Enzyme design. Structure first.
Site, PDB file in Angstrom:
ATOM      1  N   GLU A   8      -4.885  55.946 -69.787  1.00  0.00           N
ATOM      2  CA  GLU A   8      -4.675  55.245 -71.050  1.00  0.00           C
ATOM      3  C   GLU A   8      -5.183  56.111 -72.200  1.00  0.00           C
ATOM      4  O   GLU A   8      -6.374  56.373 -72.307  1.00  0.00           O
ATOM      5  CB  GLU A   8      -5.407  53.900 -71.041  1.00  0.00           C
ATOM      6  CG  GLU A   8      -5.000  52.972 -69.909  1.00  0.00           C
ATOM      7  CD  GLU A   8      -5.814  51.690 -69.877  1.00  0.00           C
ATOM      8  OE1 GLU A   8      -6.984  51.710 -70.316  1.00  0.00           O
ATOM      9  OE2 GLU A   8      -5.281  50.659 -69.416  1.00  0.00           O
ATOM     10  N   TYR A  48       0.882  50.380 -76.997  1.00  0.00           N
ATOM     11  CA  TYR A  48       0.248  49.321 -77.784  1.00  0.00           C
ATOM     12  C   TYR A  48      -0.765  49.808 -78.816  1.00  0.00           C
ATOM     13  O   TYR A  48      -0.858  50.997 -79.093  1.00  0.00           O
ATOM     14  CB  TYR A  48      -0.377  48.262 -76.865  1.00  0.00           C
ATOM     15  CG  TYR A  48      -1.442  48.781 -75.922  1.00  0.00           C
ATOM     16  CD1 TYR A  48      -1.110  49.587 -74.839  1.00  0.00           C
ATOM     17  CD2 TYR A  48      -2.777  48.443 -76.100  1.00  0.00           C
ATOM     18  CE1 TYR A  48      -2.077  50.059 -73.971  1.00  0.00           C
ATOM     19  CE2 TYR A  48      -3.752  48.907 -75.235  1.00  0.00           C
ATOM     20  CZ  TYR A  48      -3.396  49.713 -74.171  1.00  0.00           C
ATOM     21  OH  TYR A  48      -4.361  50.180 -73.307  1.00  0.00           O
ATOM     22  N   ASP A  50      -4.802  49.681 -79.692  1.00  0.00           N
ATOM     23  CA  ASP A  50      -6.112  49.380 -79.140  1.00  0.00           C
ATOM     24  C   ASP A  50      -7.178  50.134 -79.921  1.00  0.00           C
ATOM     25  O   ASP A  50      -7.081  51.350 -80.094  1.00  0.00           O
ATOM     26  CB  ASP A  50      -6.150  49.768 -77.665  1.00  0.00           C
ATOM     27  CG  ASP A  50      -7.476  49.457 -77.009  1.00  0.00           C
ATOM     28  OD1 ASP A  50      -8.126  48.466 -77.407  1.00  0.00           O
ATOM     29  OD2 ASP A  50      -7.864  50.207 -76.087  1.00  0.00           O
ATOM     30  N   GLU A  55      -1.786  53.644 -78.585  1.00  0.00           N
ATOM     31  CA  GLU A  55      -2.195  53.985 -77.230  1.00  0.00           C
ATOM     32  C   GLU A  55      -1.037  53.954 -76.241  1.00  0.00           C
ATOM     33  O   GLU A  55      -0.201  53.040 -76.261  1.00  0.00           O
ATOM     34  CB  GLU A  55      -3.334  53.077 -76.741  1.00  0.00           C
ATOM     35  CG  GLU A  55      -3.762  53.360 -75.301  1.00  0.00           C
ATOM     36  CD  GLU A  55      -5.114  52.770 -74.943  1.00  0.00           C
ATOM     37  OE1 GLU A  55      -5.388  51.622 -75.334  1.00  0.00           O
ATOM     38  OE2 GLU A  55      -5.907  53.461 -74.268  1.00  0.00           O
ATOM     39  N   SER A  57      -0.236  53.939 -72.164  1.00  0.00           N
ATOM     40  CA  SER A  57      -0.711  53.803 -70.794  1.00  0.00           C
ATOM     41  C   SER A  57       0.384  54.217 -69.833  1.00  0.00           C
ATOM     42  O   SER A  57       1.490  53.673 -69.864  1.00  0.00           O
ATOM     43  CB  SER A  57      -1.136  52.364 -70.498  1.00  0.00           C
ATOM     44  OG  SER A  57      -2.255  51.997 -71.285  1.00  0.00           O
ATOM     45  N   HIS A 111      -8.916  56.997 -71.207  1.00  0.00           N
ATOM     46  CA  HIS A 111      -9.369  56.247 -70.046  1.00  0.00           C
ATOM     47  C   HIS A 111      -8.640  56.661 -68.778  1.00  0.00           C
ATOM     48  O   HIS A 111      -7.435  56.921 -68.790  1.00  0.00           O
ATOM     49  CB  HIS A 111      -9.173  54.746 -70.269  1.00  0.00           C
ATOM     50  CG  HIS A 111      -9.506  54.289 -71.655  1.00  0.00           C
ATOM     51  ND1 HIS A 111     -10.796  54.266 -72.143  1.00  0.00           N
ATOM     52  CD2 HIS A 111      -8.716  53.835 -72.656  1.00  0.00           C
ATOM     53  CE1 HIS A 111     -10.784  53.818 -73.387  1.00  0.00           C
ATOM     54  NE2 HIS A 111      -9.535  53.551 -73.722  1.00  0.00           N
ATOM     55  N   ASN A 113      -7.970  55.146 -65.015  1.00  0.00           N
ATOM     56  CA  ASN A 113      -8.089  54.008 -64.114  1.00  0.00           C
ATOM     57  C   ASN A 113      -7.830  54.424 -62.680  1.00  0.00           C
ATOM     58  O   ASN A 113      -6.808  55.039 -62.385  1.00  0.00           O
ATOM     59  CB  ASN A 113      -7.130  52.888 -64.513  1.00  0.00           C
ATOM     60  CG  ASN A 113      -7.318  52.447 -65.945  1.00  0.00           C
ATOM     61  OD1 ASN A 113      -8.355  51.889 -66.305  1.00  0.00           O
ATOM     62  ND2 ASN A 113      -6.312  52.694 -66.775  1.00  0.00           N
ATOM     63  N   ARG A 195     -11.223  47.998 -59.758  1.00  0.00           N
ATOM     64  CA  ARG A 195     -10.704  48.961 -60.723  1.00  0.00           C
ATOM     65  C   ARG A 195     -11.823  49.734 -61.399  1.00  0.00           C
ATOM     66  O   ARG A 195     -12.676  49.161 -62.078  1.00  0.00           O
ATOM     67  CB  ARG A 195      -9.855  48.258 -61.776  1.00  0.00           C
ATOM     68  CG  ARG A 195      -9.196  49.174 -62.799  1.00  0.00           C
ATOM     69  CD  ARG A 195      -9.211  48.502 -64.162  1.00  0.00           C
ATOM     70  NE  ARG A 195      -8.223  49.043 -65.090  1.00  0.00           N
ATOM     71  CZ  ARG A 195      -8.115  48.653 -66.357  1.00  0.00           C
ATOM     72  NH1 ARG A 195      -8.937  47.729 -66.833  1.00  0.00           N
ATOM     73  NH2 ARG A 195      -7.193  49.183 -67.148  1.00  0.00           N
ATOM     74  N   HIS A 197     -12.828  52.036 -64.268  1.00  0.00           N
ATOM     75  CA  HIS A 197     -12.407  52.380 -65.619  1.00  0.00           C
ATOM     76  C   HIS A 197     -13.333  53.463 -66.172  1.00  0.00           C
ATOM     77  O   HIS A 197     -14.505  53.206 -66.444  1.00  0.00           O
ATOM     78  CB  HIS A 197     -12.465  51.128 -66.500  1.00  0.00           C
ATOM     79  CG  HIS A 197     -11.719  51.250 -67.794  1.00  0.00           C
ATOM     80  ND1 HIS A 197     -10.359  51.468 -67.853  1.00  0.00           N
ATOM     81  CD2 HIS A 197     -12.141  51.158 -69.078  1.00  0.00           C
ATOM     82  CE1 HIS A 197      -9.978  51.521 -69.117  1.00  0.00           C
ATOM     83  NE2 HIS A 197     -11.040  51.334 -69.880  1.00  0.00           N
TER      84      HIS A 197
END
Length: 456
Positions: A8, A48, A50, A55, A57, A111, A113, A195, A197
């Protein structure tokens, strides 16, 4: 190599000659420009706003190569989005950078994940991940001009994000940033999956860098899950160690472990590497796949080179390439590290524009090593990975998009004409809804109602 993973990326955003322009408004403008502010794309990706940044993803992927691919596609999507935002009735020209800071004190994250076993204890995860995340910036760092959060201190450093982290393990807040984030939102079956992160990494332009970042981490996670690591790599003052490793681009800084041993970041990385080779040998023997081999070999070679000379890695690594350019400017113009021009070069390295990007211009000069072809990147813009649930989501949005009320990692919500309630199709399992699973079915169905019928 198989692990469910994603990236992300919050992009730096700037509107020149527009002091009144709001970051939130500009970000949303960028997202709404590529929209043809939260949207899901046909490649399974999400786009989106953020923390007041545009951002991207990546869709769920099973390997670092695919991660690199769809992330790189994310870059192109961002550039195109900005270019389209320039043509809207409001003529804001928006510049996007893939990086972690504006050197005005603002910090925004990249980020990672990862999906892990729920059965794996969080204490072991923290214990073995902390020294790894602290020292991995040696090949991971995208490089930064200026020292400290305000960037007022004169110098160059390995990591953009390092000066912004004050704590070892906790929840990500505006007030504090943990090395290990404890927030767990799997978007997968909770009993089966946890998960992870990871907010500590810098956004990487280099495909090799992202490859190593995702891959080596995946290996370490695999080791942690099997309880393979007997050794204790624990470091005294891990946060200070992070800062200090960042602030020594000569890579000679030694950090103190809990067993008393003093070693550099590269050396601790070599420890993790040898542990990884031992693990993969014992576990997979002869059957070990090409990608795991490639990641191991690249990890080793990168470390050994870093020790021998950093600058031979200029084609592979972000901070080394950027440092090469910066030192070019420094030799040419006799500039100390406090020159504004240097910070401008630092910034422009991450520009997503094809012509104005320094990484991009390096690629055009064949001065950067690439894992994937540009054709595959273009394809990865509009099309999903085959081996995860992002396939189902993407193809549903492509074919049935007119009938789609909403979409998320967790579910696809259809509006079936003639039906009162929206029909919610859950996707809990990231490893289902793949091409092998739903591909043929999606080929068959002429209607979303037909698809929903077949799934019930």
């Amino acid at each position: 190599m198989h692990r469910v993973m994603g990236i992300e990326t919050e992009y730096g955003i700037s509107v020149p000659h527009q002091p009144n322009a709001n970051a939130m408004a500009a970000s949303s403008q960028v997202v709404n420009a590529y929209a043809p502010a939260n949207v899901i794309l046909t490649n399974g990706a999400r786009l989106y706003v953020d923390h007041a940044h545009p951002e991207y993803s990546t869709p769920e992927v099973t390997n670092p190569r695919d991660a690199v691919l769809w992330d790189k596609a994310g870059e192109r999507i961002m550039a195109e989005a900005a270019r389209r935002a320039a043509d809207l009735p409001m003529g804001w020209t928006i510049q996007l950078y893939k990086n972690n800071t504006d050197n005005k004190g603002a910090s925004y994250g990249c980020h990672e994940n990862y999906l892990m076993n729920r059965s794996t204890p969080f204490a072991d995860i923290v214990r073995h991940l902390i020294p790894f995340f602290v020292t991995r910036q040696v090949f991971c760092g995208a490089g930064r001009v200026g020292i400290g959060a305000d960037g007022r201190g004169e110098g160059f450093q390995l990591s953009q994000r390092a000066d912004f982290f004050e704590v070892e393990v906790g929840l990500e807040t505006t007030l504090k940033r943990p090395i290990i984030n404890t927030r767990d939102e799997p978007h997968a079956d909770p009993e089966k999956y946890r998960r992870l992160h990871v907010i500590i990494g810098d956004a990487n332009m280099s495909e090799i860098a992202t490859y190593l970042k995702l891959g080596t981490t995946a290996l370490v996670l695999a080791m942690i899950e099997d309880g393979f690591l007997s050794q204790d790599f624990s470091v005294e003052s891990p946060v200070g160690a992070l800062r200090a490793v960042s602030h020594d681009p000569t890579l000679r800084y030694q950090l103190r472990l809990h067993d008393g041993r003093r070693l550099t970041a590269v050396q601790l990385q070599m420890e993790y590497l040898e542990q990884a080779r031992k693990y993969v040998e014992d576990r997979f023997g002869t059957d070990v796949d090409d990608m795991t081999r490639d990641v191991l070999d690249r990890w080793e070679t990168t470390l050994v080179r870093l020790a021998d000379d950093p600058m031979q890695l200029s084609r592979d690594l972000d901070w080394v390439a950027k440092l090469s350019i910066l030192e070019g400017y420094r030799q040419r113009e006799n500039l100390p590290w406090s020159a504004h021009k240097l910070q401008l070069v630092d910034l422009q390295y991450h520009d997503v524009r094809p012509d104005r990007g320094l990484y991009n211009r390096l690629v055009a000069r064949g001065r950067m090593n690439l894992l994937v072809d540009e054709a595959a990147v273009r394809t990865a813009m509009h099309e999903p990975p085959n081996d995860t649930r992002a396939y189902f989501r993407g193809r549903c949005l492509a074919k049935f998009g007119a009938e789609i009320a909403a979409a998320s990692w967790d579910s696809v919500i259809f509006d079936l004409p003639g039906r009162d309630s929206l029909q919610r199709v859950p996707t809990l399992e990231p490893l289902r809804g793949t091409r092998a699973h739903v591909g043929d079915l999606l080929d068959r169905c002429r209607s979303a109602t037909e698809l929903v019928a077949a799934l019930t």
